[PDB]
Amino acid sequence: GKSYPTVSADYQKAVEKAKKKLRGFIAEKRCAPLMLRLAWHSAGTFDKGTKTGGPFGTIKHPAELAHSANNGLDIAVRLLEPLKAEFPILSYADFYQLAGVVAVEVTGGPEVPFHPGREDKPEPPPEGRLPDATKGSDHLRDVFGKAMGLTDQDIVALSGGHTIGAAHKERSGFEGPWTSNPLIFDNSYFTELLSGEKEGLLQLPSDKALLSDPVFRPLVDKYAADEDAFFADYAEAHQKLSELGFADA
Ligand code: HEM
Ligand SMILES: [K+]
């Protein structure tokens, strides 16, 4: 149910140019996972009943960066500031969601469709909307479904973003990568989740909760068996996530 706003031809030119520059910058800096987390934490605060939070540029504000769920994201913000300054016409909201999309692409992931026009909003959402890694399926549904309005399929597919990157004991407290190849976007997150724990690889309780839920589990299996199906449903879910509250909810 989206109606995307009209942006000027100069705005579109800058999107295109910024997308190319983000590719090169993110690849060189090795920060795709962090950029994906930044985009996801920007968007994931959306509350459908109040139309508050969501991907509207507010993650740049010191007050939002201070949320405990956002430890380490000040690094991402600082890393993007010089590049953003080359594209003064773009909203931060658009810029961060573009950086998220590019992060997925440059690590070998699906091409997530991108539409411009998010406006930067003045007020961050209240803290505490982002998911708790120590919790389980009910919690995931409260956050992704009751607040964000995404589906059970979306929950599982988006969890697969853990296919890139790592936790850090100085940020969340958890430590290490989910996969043996943490700068490669693939279905390995689901193959590891299924195989049991392997030395040196991380599983949050929230990841584990996918295995014992009756709706999540068949999706895990599908994605572990079929990376193409993972990529389709991942791209669908990331697009929806990046558009929460934008161009209609
Ligand atoms: C499902 C609930 C989720 C929970 C509870 C969760 C929790 C976490 C935690 C605790 C970390 C570690 C942060 C650190 O210590 O550095 C992390 C990292 C990450 N998360 Fe999530 N996450 C979830 C969903 C997602 C989603 C939906 C995405 C993207 C689609 C995502 C992408 C990432 C990425 C890319 C990293 C790694 C960042 C890096 O390498 O620096 N997560 N997540
Ligand atoms: K991987």
Residue numbers in the entry: 2 to 250
What did the original publication write about this model?
The family of heme-containing peroxidase enzymes is widespread in biology. The key to their catalytic power is the formation of two transient, oxidized heme intermediates. Ascorbate peroxidase (APX) catalyses the H2O2-dependent oxidation of ascorbate using the Compound I and Compound II intermediates.
Reaction of ferric APX with m-chloroperbenzoic acid (m-CPBA) initially yields a Compound I intermediate (λmax=409, 527, 575sh, 649 nm); this decays rapidly to a Compound II intermediate (λmax=415, 528, 558 nm), which is stable over long (500 s) timescales. Single crystal microspectrophotometry at 100 K on crystals of ferric APX reacted with m-CPBA showed absorption peaks for Compound II in the visible region (λmax=530, 560 nm) that agree with those in solution. The data indicate a high-percentage conversion in the crystal, and show that the predominant species is Compound II; we cannot rule out the presence of minor amounts of unreacted ferric enzyme (which are likely to be ferric hydroxide at this temperature). Putting aside for one moment the caveats that bond lengths in X-ray experiments are not determined precisely at this resolution, nor indeed that they report directly on protonation state, the salient point is that the Fe–O bond length measured here for Compound II is longer than that of Compound I of CcP determined by reliable X-ray determinations (that is, where photoreduction has been minimized).
